[PDB]
Amino acid sequence: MYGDLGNKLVLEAKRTKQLYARSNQDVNLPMYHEDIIRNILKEVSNLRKNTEYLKEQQQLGMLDDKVAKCQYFVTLLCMERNKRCLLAYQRLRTDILDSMAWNNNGLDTNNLSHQEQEYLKEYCDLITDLKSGDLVDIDLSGSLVPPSDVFIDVRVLKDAGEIQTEYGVFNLIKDSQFFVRQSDVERLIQQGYLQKI
């Protein structure tokens, strides 16, 4: 039926939600289900044409009070179910995009829709703007892990080369260890260049 396509889209949304919950690190999100979404939209257009025909039949007056009322109610319920399924899937994908923007953009374009990519860019701009102004003193993009360790030994996961610090330039030559405060090396760890001393 018309709601079966929306049910399939919601099933894909639940599958992606379970996958993202299973993997702590953010995987490249599944490609947007444009085919199922377009099928649901075509079904919605067909239901709208059917509702227009039912309204024309009501203008004709034949069983307009009861039969046409029930038919229009059923068609409207189908449209509402399809819209709810599409909204749920889009909201889940957009929440995944917001989580990704908080994870990386604060410090897989083919998978996203073009509107979704524009929305993710707008979300990154909003995050940068929220940090840019009031409450700029604390890096809102900074890690939410509590500062358990003031100092921690750090060495390069990758040979990125010279790196900036509060008052120093540190070479990231391969397998080069350091002893520095965790706060200064938090950004470098977010870059992935240095891991666990």
Partner: protein
């Protein structure tokens, strides 16, 4: 001009703003740009912030402090400021 004096300033204004690496040579180039004004150019600090924002918008590349691209971006931002004037 006064690259050591601008070094903490550039480091904050760039790395804290965007997470972008600032090479010491790029900080020195920004220092020469600042010294292009005979006196201290405090407005040029906001100009450098705007230049970094434009570079992030266009190039969108980490390690912008290499200054091979940042010098051309500085020329572009200076032309934009001239058009704004």
């Amino acid at each position: 001009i006064q690259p050591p004096l601008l070094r903490p300033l550039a480091y904050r204004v760039l790395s804290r703003k965007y997470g972008l690496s600032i090479k010491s040579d790029g900080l020195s180039a920004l220092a020469e740009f600042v010294g292009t004004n005979i006196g201290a150019n405090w407005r040029q600090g906001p100009a450098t912030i705007k230049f970094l924002e434009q570079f992030a918008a266009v190039w969108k590349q980490q390690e912008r402090g290499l200054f091979i691209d940042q010098s051309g971006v500085k020329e572009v931002i200076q032309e934009m400021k001239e058009r704004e004037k």
